[PDB]
Structure formats: structure tokens, C-alpha cells
Write a protein that binds this ligand. Structure first.
Ligand SMILES: [Mg+2]
Ligand SMILES: [Mg+2]
Ligand SMILES: [Mg+2]
Ligand SMILES: [Mg+2]
Ligand SMILES: [Mg+2]
Ligand SMILES: [Mg+2]
Ligand SMILES: [Mg+2]
Ligand SMILES: [Mg+2]
Ligand SMILES: [Mg+2]
Lengths: 194, 94, 130, 94, 117
RNA sequence: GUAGGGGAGCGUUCAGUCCGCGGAGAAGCCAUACCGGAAGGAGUGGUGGAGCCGACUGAAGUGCGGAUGCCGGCAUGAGU
RNA sequence: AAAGGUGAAAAGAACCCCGGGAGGGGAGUGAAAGAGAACCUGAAACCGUGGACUUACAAGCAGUCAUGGCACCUUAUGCGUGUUAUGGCGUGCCUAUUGAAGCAUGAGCCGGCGACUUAGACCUGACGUGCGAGCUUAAGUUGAAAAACGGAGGCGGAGC
């Protein structure tokens, strides 16, 4: 039930998720997402096998005050680790219903406050990066917020490059994380929208 | 906001650490610590000594299509040879 | 006062009557015996005793006593006729090793070690008690 | 004092276990047992005929005392903190 | 990722150690022996904490019948005659009444006498 | 109250957010009579000289007195 | 096998003093030498120096409680802190056990390392979430600051 910033109207479509903004599902979603991103890289020599050591030692019974088999065991120094990390995945598929329920619930979570849909990007005028600051100031972005821009038109994205103000998300490749992370979501391009 | 984002409220508990616990020394005192041999089944206890043969086959099996299902609801769309897949018999194979 | 590094740079940290023998190869436990008689009496006596004390540790203990008197008399502008050991004491040492006995838990057993342990230091002040 | 006053101890700030009614100097009174005051001595039940008065000074929490317990060879160590509450009452009365 | 034990053990240990003060020799200095001293120390702490009350009981009594006897009665006899009079629920710490204030304790004695014969 | 089962939590590394702090000085180390029901946590003071708390969430090589345990260091036997 | 660190910068210590030396004390450079080449921090065991209170008729798991002396007042003049004299009480820890102060195992002391884990379209249960008589995808394809697609198949749905 929402306005467009330039040109047309619409966005009175899109029934938002019920109840409005359930944060549990949100948490589930993002957690899944970071978990998807998580890259297992494990530098561990677990086994007494991994590290380099010859394996027969010295006398068993009869040396006294001793008791050992080998130098590669985890009770030794320099040896293997008992239960260290190995190269795993931890990537799964969260059920798709929730995969699409989430981002909707995010956009919904942007209805307690500011969000925006745009058309007519010609106010950018190539890139120049300056006219993006302008466009923002005229469209109400102090740049004291954090902003995510979702649009096509490479000319239009590439106007925005900076840490302070904004971040860019092409071709409606949107992330529940990315939009929930930033303060303002500029939904911009009305393609995936409406 | 991710930082104001809450938990599941009771999805998971924390795991189980047997390190510490001030007087945990785990499992069973003798006998059945350390082994990977536990193994609940096996021919030893009262499975063999039990007297059957018969023989295995399991031939043709059919989709069970409830009458109650067919009647009552829908249209009587005259099910026949194709539409039926959308009617939830879904098998193939049989 | 001001703050930390202010104090640090307005003040250079003197050490009146102080000198130290580092690393004299000898065992400090021994050297304490020599030192203990010196401590507390007038640096003259100290020089005498030390001349006449039969321990070999007496030797570098005398060598140091003078340097600390010598520091007192020159750097601190003190009075050698008010001079006495305010303090002396011995400890430490990076106890020596060549680690030539590579030890396979056997056949040489345990021997040697040669403590570097000396670190003899003495500190001189003026009596002025009278 | 088992709980609640007695005898004669006069013009003195002291402590008891918690006073029920809180206040800044909300008056609390006590019936007696003996009296060392008045430069005389006469026993009990003649002190039930007398009434001492006292004002409530502050409501306190005493000094923290740790509670440790241990049993040999069974494991079993127990650590718990304890602070027992009080009321400082000032005593001047008949 | 690993978590080295760093500064965790050391802290705990330092705390235990600090609990040990006028402890003789090894106890006050090296950890293990300190800690395990502190186990038996617990035992004596809590138990003597329940105890000192038995102790002070003993002391006070030991004074009370002392004074009683100075007057010609005893603890048995004194509390017998005192409590025989519904007069005195007096009881607690009364020892210092015998110790500090003699005339009073004398009156309590004579009271205990009138409550006998 | 022992094996055993159930409940609440403390502390440590990493990660994402949040809030911030630091050469008028970070963490770390040192002492300390305060706070908390415990794991523990602050206040200030001394060291240090380049970095780091707090909050929420997530992941662990995550908590030692023992194993004639491992590497190291330093004692006792002794000025024998 | 172990083995890393001055400082921003060599400005890495001319000169002077004690000493054959090693070593240190000044001067000087430097923000700092509370960085000096046995050069970041610098714990603990362990050895000393000085001080406070103490100890030479007392049978001691070293503590614990109670009181007195003495000394100290930065969370700190109080329910204090340190030390002590006397009284009462008081059979290390762990393990293994019918039973441990045990004249039964273990261990010199302090660091630091050191033990219930990971995996699979597995099996079963508890809690939580999404759809709900339906519920889901796998390989793979495509975008990849980002994820969608992919119904092969699997599980309910009928039993004997
Ligand atoms: Mg066992
Ligand atoms: Mg000889
Ligand atoms: Mg001998
Ligand atoms: Mg001999
Ligand atoms: Mg005080
Ligand atoms: Mg144990
Ligand atoms: Mg048993
Ligand atoms: Mg034994
Ligand atoms: Mg024995």
C-alpha cells in the first residue's frame, strides 16, 4: 500500500506477511544465510596420523616413570589435536516457503518507517556520483542513514559508490540480510516490486 | 535491525560438554567406556532361535484410491487416463 | 607533576652509590657469605676485610665495592669519609649452558650446570648519623 | 536480644534483624525484661509494666559472607554468597 | 577456530591464591596445595560457624553458675528458681549481668530463692 | 546425597550487527577492605606502549590438580 | 630439534669515571634509555635485600572459630586491614572401594599443552518454525557483495 518517488503510482499491491513482522522467522532466515555464506576452512592436524612422526618409542614396562607409545598423540606437545576442525560445509536448503516468506517479511518490516520505490532514473545524468548525492538530498536521504539500492541500469547503480551513504543490489538479487542490515531500503526499480 | 533481532525462543538448548561439571566423570564406571562396540542387535539374544522362513516376494502393488476421495468434493471431472495425476494418486511405478 | 610521560621526560632517574657486577661466573650462594660481613660498615673496613678474606668470591666483590665508591665520589660528588655500604646483595645469573649434553634420558645421567648466578651489586651512602 | 529488645540499653544506635515496618525514624516500641537504668535493679514482669521507645535509623544489608561446603572424596563442593538484612534502630525511651 | 586457555586459568588461580594469606609455607604460595587446603578450610568454616554458638552457650552458662555459686545456688538451682517464677523469661546472655553488675545478679538470686522456699 | 536424569546460567576465542573508548594513552600484567545466589563482575591506584570493552545473535580446537600424563623452567637432596 | 620483537628513525651511545676484562655509573641522542643491542610486554615457580608484627617447656594435615596485644587507615575509622599470643574444634587431595588420614594408587613445585568429537539426502525421540492433507526437493542450470530455478525422487495417503 505504498507510494512511488518519481513518475507513476502503484505499490498499493503486495499484501504483506502475517502477522506483520514476525522476527523469529526473520532470525531463522538470516542465520541460515550467514550459515550458507560460511566457508569451512580447517587448519587442524587432528589425528596422531596427520603430523610427521615415526611411531615406535622406547620400553613399555621397565623404563619407569614413563608409560608412552608415540610422539604424535594429542597428550603430547607438537602432536595431533584431539577433535580439531576439519574441512566441512554446514550449507543446507532452508525450506523455500520460508526463503520467500522472509524477504517479504523484511519489506513488511520496512512499513513501520521509511522505504521507497522509484521510477524515472534520468535525474542521475550519466554517473558523476555527485548527482547521486543530489538525487538523495532531493529525495530526502541525509546520508546519515544506511541505504540499499535495488535497480537495473548499470549507469544508475554506478552512480552510488561509498561506505557512508549507500550500497548497491542489482537485478533484484535481494537479500533479507542485506535489506535488514541497512537502515533505508530504496526498492527503486519497480520490476520485482508490484 | 539485526542487533535488535531476537532468538527463536526455545528452538535449541546449548550442547553437551562433559569437560568440567565438578564431579562428572562420564558414562559407566567399568566396562562400556571407550568402546565403539556397543551394538544393540545381534544374533546372540532371542532373534535367532526364532523360527521363521516363509519367503519374500512383494510383487505388483496398486495405488489405493479412496472412494470418499473420488465422490463428495470436486466436479466429477471424469477422471479417466490423464487428469488423475493432478487428483493425487501420485505414484507412477505402479 | 602533570601526567605519566611528562614526569618521564622532566626526570632522568639517578642511582646514587650504586654499581653492579653482572654475570660473574660463580655461585651466588657462595658470594653471599663473603658479602654478608662487608654489609653495614665503613667502606674503608670493607676494603680491608675484602683484602684479607680467604674466599675467592672476595675478589670480584672488592672489585665492585670500589666502583660503587668510585661512582659515589665522582658522579654523586659524595664524601669518602662519610661513606659506608648502605646496602649490598647478590642473586640471579643466567645459569650457564652449552647444552652439549644432548640427553636421551640416559647414560650420562645428570651432571654439571655451572651457575652464572653471581650478579653482585653494592650500594654506597654517606652515614651522616654521627 | 533474641529478636526484639529488652533490659536497659539507652541513647544508642544498634541493629536488629529486619524491622517489618520501614520508615525514616518511624517509631518502634519495646516492652522490657530487666532494667539497668534509674540506678536500681528489679526483675522481670515488673518490666512488662514498663515501655521503652526507639526510633528506626536505617535499613541495612550486612557484610557479605561466603558459604562453602565440601565432602571428602565424593566430589561435592558448594559455593553460595550470603547477605542477611537488618534494621539499625536508635534507642532512647522510658 | 581455537580458544587458548590464556588468562582464564591464571585469573581463577590468582583468586584462589589470594584467598590464602597467613597460611604457612607451601599453602600460601603455590596453587594446588593452597586450594586443597581450602577444602578442609571450608569444612571447618561452616562447621565451626554452626558451632561457636554451642561455644558461647557454654561460656555464658559457665559464668552464670559461677556467680550463682558466689551467692549460694547453682545453674541448675538458679534457672530452676528463676524460671519457676514466670517472672523471668530473662534467659539470654545473663552471664554479663552476673559479671558486670553484681547487685542486680544478687537480686535475681534472692528472687530465685523466694521462688523456692 | 554417589553413579544417573532434569532446570536455569557464568567465563573464553572467533563472526555479524549495535554502541562507542584510546598517545591527556588500548589490551595485557600488578595490588586492593567494593558488587552479585554461584560461576563471576566493576571502582580506583601502579606497569605498559597499539589497541580494546559493553550489548544482541551465531559458531566453537571453549574452561584442568591429578592420567608413574607432554614441552619448559626452577627447587629438594647441599655447599653433600 | 628448539629457535621471532631496540627505536618512528640508527640518532645504535663521542667523552669521562671503577676495572686486564666482563660489567656497570655519568654525559649525550631519543617522546621515552621506566627502549641500550642477555634491547615489547614480563605472570608463576624459584633466590635474595630491607621493613612490620613475631618465635628458643611444645607434640604439631598447617587450617577453622572465639577473645586479647601490637602495627597500619587510597573500595579504608569499621560489621576494618596486617600480624600475632591463648583457648575450643580439627584424620591431605584424588582414584579404587564392603570399607581410606591411610602403613593402598598417583603426584617435586609453577607455568603452558592436554580428553565425549566430526560425518551421512541414516534411525528414533523432545522443543521450535513454514506450509498443512498435504509437505519437500537431489544432481545440476543460472546469477553470484546477493540467490533463484531445478519435481528425478523421497515421506504421508490401507490393511491382512
Ligand atoms: Mg575411572
Ligand atoms: Mg670444600
Ligand atoms: Mg648428608
Ligand atoms: Mg660427611
Ligand atoms: Mg576501622
Ligand atoms: Mg578428579
Ligand atoms: Mg560404591
Ligand atoms: Mg598415600
Ligand atoms: Mg603416610
Amino acid at each position: 500500500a505504498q507510494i512511488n518517488v518519481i513518475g507513476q503510482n502503484g505499490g498499493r499491491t503486495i499484501e504483506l506477511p502475517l502477522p506483520e513482522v514476525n522476527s523469529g522467522v526473520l532470525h531463522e532466515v538470516v542465520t541460515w544465510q550467514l550459515a550458507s555464506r560460511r566457508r569451512g576452512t580447517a587448519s587442524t592436524r587432528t589425528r596422531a596420523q596427520v603430523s610427521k612422526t615415526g611411531r615406535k618409542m622406547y620400553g613399555q614396562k621397565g623404563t619407569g616413570n614413563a608409560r608412552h607409545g608415540d610422539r604424535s598423540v594429542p597428550t603430547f606437545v607438537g602432536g595431533g589435536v584431539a577433535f580439531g576442525p576439519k574441512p566441512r560445509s554446514y550449507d543446507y536448503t532452508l525450506p523455500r516457503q520460508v526463503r520467500q516468506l522472509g524477504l517479504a517479511m523484511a519489506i513488511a518490516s520496512r512499513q513501520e518507517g521509511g522505504k521507497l520505490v522509484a521510477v524515472d532514473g534520468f535525474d542521475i545524468a550519466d554517473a558523476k556520483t555527485k548527482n547521486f548525492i543530489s538525487w538523495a538530498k532531493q529525495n530526502g536521504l541525509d546520508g546519515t542513514e544506511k541505504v540499499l539500492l535495488v535497480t537495473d541500469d548499470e549507469n544508475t547503480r554506478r552512480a552510488a559508490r561509498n561506505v557512508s551513504w549507500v550500497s548497491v543490489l542489482p537485478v533484484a538479487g535481494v537479500n533479507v540480510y542485506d535489506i535488514l542490515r541497512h537502515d533505508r531500503l530504496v526498492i527503486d526499480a519497480a520490476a520485482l516490486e508490484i | 535491525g539485526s542487533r535488535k533481532d531476537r532468538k527463536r525462543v526455545g528452538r535449541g538448548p546449548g550442547g553437551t560438554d562433559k569437560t568440567a561439571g565438578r564431579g562428572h566423570k562420564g558414562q559407566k564406571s567399568r566396562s562400556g567406556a571407550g568402546k565403539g562396540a556397543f551394538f544393540e542387535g545381534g544374533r546372540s539374544r532371542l532373534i535367532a532361535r526364532l523360527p521363521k522362513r516363509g519367503f519374500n516376494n512383494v510383487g505388483t502393488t496398486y495405488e489405493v484410491v479412496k472412494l470418499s476421495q473420488l465422490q463428495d468434493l470436486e466436479d466429477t471431472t471424469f477422471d479417466r487416463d490423464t487428469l488423475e495425476a493432478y487428483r493425487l494418486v501420485r505414484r507412477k511405478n505402479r | 607533576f602533570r601526567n605519566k610521560k611528562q614526569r618521564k621526560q622532566q626526570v632522568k632517574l639517578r642511582k646514587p652509590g650504586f654499581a653492579v657486577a653482572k654475570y660473574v661466573r660463580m655461585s651466588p650462594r657462595k658470594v653471599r657469605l663473603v658479602v654478608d660481613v662487608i654489609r653495614g660498615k665503613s667502606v674503608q673496613d670493607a676494603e680491608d676485610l675484602l683484602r684479607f678474606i680467604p674466599r675467592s668470591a672476595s675478589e670480584p666483590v672488592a672489585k665492585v665495592l670500589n666502583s660503587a665508591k668510585a661512582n659515589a665520589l665522582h658522579n654523586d660528588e659524595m664524601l669518602e669519609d662519610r661513606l659506608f655500604v648502605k646496602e649490598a646483595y647478590v642473586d640471579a645469573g643466567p645459569t650457564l649452558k652449552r647444552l652439549i649434553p644432548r640427553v636421551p634420558r640416559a647414560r650420562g645421567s645428570a651432571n654439571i650446570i655451572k651457575k652464572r648466578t653471581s650478579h653482585i651489586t653494592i650500594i654506597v651512602a654517606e652515614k651522616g648519623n654521627k | 536480644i533474641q529478636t526484639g529488645g529488652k533490659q536497659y540499653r539507652v541513647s544508642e544506635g544498634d541493629v536488629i534483624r529486619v524491622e517489618s515496618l520501614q520508615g525514616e525514624a518511624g517509631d518502634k516500641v519495646e516492652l522490657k525484661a530487666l532494667f539497668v537504668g534509674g540506678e536500681q535493679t528489679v526483675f522481670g514482669e515488673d518490666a512488662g509494666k514498663y515501655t521503652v521507645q526507639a526510633e528506626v535509623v536505617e535499613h541495612g544489608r550486612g557484610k557479605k559472607i561466603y558459604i562453602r561446603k565440601y565432602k571428602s572424596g565424593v566430589q561435592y563442593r558448594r559455593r553460595t554468597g550470603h547477605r542477611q538484612n537488618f534494621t539499625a534502630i536508635k534507642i532512647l525511651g522510658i | 577456530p581455537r580458544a587458548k586457555t590464556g588468562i582464564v586459568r591464571r585469573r581463577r588461580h590468582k583468586k584462589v591464591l589470594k584467598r590464602a594469606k597467613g597460611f604457612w609455607g607451601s599453602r600460601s604460595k603455590q596453587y594446588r596445595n593452597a586450594f586443597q587446603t581450602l577444602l578442609n578450610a571450608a569444612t571447618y568454616e561452616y562447621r565451626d560457624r554452626r558451632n561457636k554458638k554451642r561455644d558461647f552457650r557454654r561460656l555464658w552458662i559457665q559464668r552464670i553458675n559461677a556467680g550463682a555459686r558466689l551467692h549460694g545456688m547453682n545453674y541448675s538451682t538458679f534457672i530452676n528458681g528463676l524460671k519457676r517464677a514466670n517472672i523471668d523469661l530473662n534467659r539470654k546472655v545473663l552471664a554479663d549481668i552476673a559479671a558486670r553488675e553484681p547487685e542486680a545478679f544478687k537480686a535475681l538470686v534472692d528472687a530465685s530463692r523466694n521462688a523456692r522456699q
